[PDB]
Swiss-Prot record:
Coiled-coil parts of chain: none
Top-level taxon in the UniProt lineage: Bacteria
Entry function: Involved in the transposition of the insertion sequence.
Family under the similarity heading: Belongs to the transposase IS21/IS408/IS1162 family.
Taxonomy of the source species: Bacteria, Bacillati, Bacillota, Bacilli, Bacillales
Name assigned to this protein: Putative transposase for insertion sequence element IS5376
Organism of this sequence: Geobacillus stearothermophilus
Amino acid sequence: ESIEELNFLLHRWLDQVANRKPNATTGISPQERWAEESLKPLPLKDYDTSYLSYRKVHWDGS
DNA sequence: TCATGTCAAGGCCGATTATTTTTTCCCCAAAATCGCCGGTTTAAAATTCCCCAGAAGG
């Protein structure tokens, strides 16, 4: 009934089975290969992805 | 070094485990069938005993 609930269930399902079941070709649990991965470090501050609009305040202040 | 399809599930087969049913084996008792031996009966074959004729010897 809520997208937050759906995302929570999806993440739990992934971490339970999807990223735990061994792959049919690599034949190994994805998390072990993840541990083998070497990704570049993240920046401290994330690229701000937020709608930016300019508005005007009414006479009263509303 | 570019760019470059990949993973999961379903179905089928084989092997293993569990449950049920059927068949066999062993031992004991009773009945039936079959086998062997002996005796009896029937049929066929063999041997010995009396009178007629022929042949041989003195």
